Amino acid sequence: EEEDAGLVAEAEAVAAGWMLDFLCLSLCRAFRDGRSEDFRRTRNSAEAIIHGLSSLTACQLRTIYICQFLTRIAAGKTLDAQFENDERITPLESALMIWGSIEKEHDKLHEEIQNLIKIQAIAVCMENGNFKEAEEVFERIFMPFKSKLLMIISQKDTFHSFFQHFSYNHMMEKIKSYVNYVLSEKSSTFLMKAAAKVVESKR
Amino acid sequence: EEEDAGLVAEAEAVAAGWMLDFLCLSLCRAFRDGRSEDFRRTRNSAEAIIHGLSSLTACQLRTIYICQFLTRIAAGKTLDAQFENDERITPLESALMIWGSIEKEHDKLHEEIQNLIKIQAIAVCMENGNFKEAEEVFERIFMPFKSKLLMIISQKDTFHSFFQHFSYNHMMEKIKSYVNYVLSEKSSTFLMKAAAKVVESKR
Ligand SMILES: O=C(CN1CCNCC1)Nc1ccc(F)cc1
Ligand SMILES: O=C(CN1CCNCC1)Nc1ccc(F)cc1
Ligand SMILES: [Ca+2]
Ligand SMILES: [Ca+2]
């Protein structure tokens, strides 16, 4: 009776782990496809399942970080969203913090995404007319790119050509390339593989 | 490319269906065990997964109704909770409405649970001092039990002996017997069975 309850609780942790991987894969696919409402609904599901988990393996922490990272990137232009206990941290600064915390390879693509998030964190403040906020984001994040960015902030050059070369769309595209690699690695997770074989068996 | 997206969406509907059954089983077990915080967290998970589903089979509608029914019973003494668009409907009246909508057998246990919910819907108003509300709940729900209940409402007999014979604990116990039958039927669902075999394989 007591041992049965322990085995049931362990089984629930196994199923919750399978649910986390499934929801990360669906969140990644919605992000890549630009399906905004599916991403919103899947994010709600992922967040609730994460609250029902305690012990996490390193792989599960990485999966959670990826979900949190995409959530902040999707809300990158929503300067009213508070993703950290410190209310000053903007969504792209919060995305930057998680990006440098994921246990992943630091290849050329990693650094390009990192630098694009840094540039856009300032650019999204300038585009809203939040000039003093852009300076504060600059001080929290940060030679050649650094001095060009400070010059842009002081000149209030909102639509500066520098932000066209290193644009929001460019950041999204590079992030989507990374998302494609994550979708390839987790396409073999238990829940998706089982559902896939069921769909194929009915075709 | 377009056909692959259709097959992926179908696979997500299969996995979401498996998730619904799993969460109903975990919600039922938390209710039976009196694990309040696990029930709250599992309910949040079930509600989010239900928002990501469109087409429902009759079996899925029944599963959803059971989750909604237990949610209202758990909140039966929370007269500040609005479970319906009509703000006058109390949680036990809302539980009563779903109970008469489930496609299930109307055995002796069904009618006993139905009558206990009716009695307690009035009793929970009386215990809070909401005498006029109890009369209004009476008029919405409703000869021998009916006249005894109207006499109790007019006399303001909050702790009347009638409510001791047909008590809240009695309603919970009869509901838990039904929950035991639901746990037996869905213990064989795909996700729980797969997680169970994994846990057993490691023992
Ligand atoms: O963003 C958070 C909240 N959490 C992040 C770290 N600091 C504030 C607390 N969780 C989340 C999980 C999974 C998602 F898909 C989305 C959000
Ligand atoms: O209670 C509702 C809300 N819903 C019920 C019908 N009228 C108001 C809209 N959903 C729910 C689903 C699953 C749960 F586990 C808990 C609640
Ligand atoms: Ca703000
Ligand atoms: Ca009320």
From Swiss-Prot, chains A, B:
One of its GO terms (molecular function) is DNA binding, bending. One of its GO terms (biological process) is telomere maintenance. The modification Phosphoserine is found at S154. Induction: Expression is tightly regulated during the cell cycle; levels are low in G1 and S phase and increase during G2 phase and mitosis. Changing W18P: Abolishes telomere binding. It is found in: Nucleus; Cytoplasm, Cytoskeleton, Spindle; Chromosome, Telomere. Changing L61R: Loss of interaction with FBXO4. Changing A15D: Abolishes dimerization and telomere binding. GO terms for cellular component: chromosome, telomeric region; cytoplasm; fibrillar center; nuclear body; nuclear telomere cap complex; nucleolus; nucleoplasm; nucleus. Keywords: Acetylation, ADP-ribosylation, Cell cycle, Cell division, Chromosome, Cytoplasm, Cytoskeleton, DNA-binding, Isopeptide bond, Mitosis, Nucleus, Phosphoprotein, Telomere, Ubl conjugation. Its main location: nucleus. There is a cross-link at K148 (Glycyl lysine isopeptide (Lys-Gly) (interchain with G-Cter in SUMO2)). Residues 1-203 are annotated as: TRFH mediates dimerization. It comes from the Eukaryota. Phosphorylated preferentially on Ser-154 in an ATM-dependent manner in response to ionizing DNA damage. Highly expressed and ubiquitous. Isoform Pin2 predominates. Homodimer; can contain both isoforms. Found in a complex with POT1; TINF2 and TNKS1. Interacts with ATM, TINF2, TNKS1, TNKS2, PINX1, NEK2 and MAPRE1. Component of the shelterin complex (telosome) composed of TERF1, TERF2, TINF2, TERF2IP ACD and POT1. Interacts with RLIM (via N-terminus). Interacts with FBXO4. Interaction with TINF2 protects against interaction with FBXO4 and subsequent polyubiquitination and proteasomal degradation. Interacts with GNL3L; this interaction promotes homodimerization. Interacts with TIN2. Interacts with RTEL1. The acidic N-terminal domain binds to the ankyrin repeats of TNKS1 and TNKS2. The C-terminal domain binds microtubules. Binds the telomeric double-stranded 5'-TTAGGG-3' repeat and negatively regulates telomere length. Involved in the regulation of the mitotic spindle. Component of the shelterin complex (telosome) that is involved in the regulation of telomere length and protection. Shelterin associates with arrays of double-stranded 5'-TTAGGG-3' repeats added by telomerase and protects chromosome ends; without its protective activity, telomeres are no longer hidden from the DNA damage surveillance and chromosome ends are inappropriately processed by DNA repair pathways. This is Telomeric repeat-binding factor 1. It comes from Homo sapiens. The chain holds residues 60 to 268 of 439 of the full protein.
